[PDB]
Amino acid sequence: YNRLCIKPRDWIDECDSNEGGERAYFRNGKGGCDSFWICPEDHTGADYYSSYRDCFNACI
């Protein structure tokens, strides 16, 4: 399940701006992209969408 575009893991989506890592952009089967913050914690490489518009155009 779940393409790169879709993160299976709520991964502490609360390390907010400055309180956290980069913003990263994903897209669940609701009807929009959802950006989260990575935190320094899940330094998973994060080969993810950087630009909002990429997540949006790629997956919407």
Note whether 28 and 34 are within 8 A (CB): yes
Domain with residue 32: its CATH number is 4.10.410.10
| Gap between the Cα atoms of 57 and 49, Å rounded | 11
Find the domain containing 39 and state its range: 1-60
End-to-end CA distance of the chain: 18
Q: Tell me how the structure was determined.
A: NMR
- Structural domains in the chain (count): 1
Question: 8: alpha, beta or left, given left = phi > 0 and alpha = psi -120 to 50?
Answer: beta
How many CB atoms are closer than 10 A to CB 38? Answer: 20
Q: Give the number of residues written for the chain.
A: 60
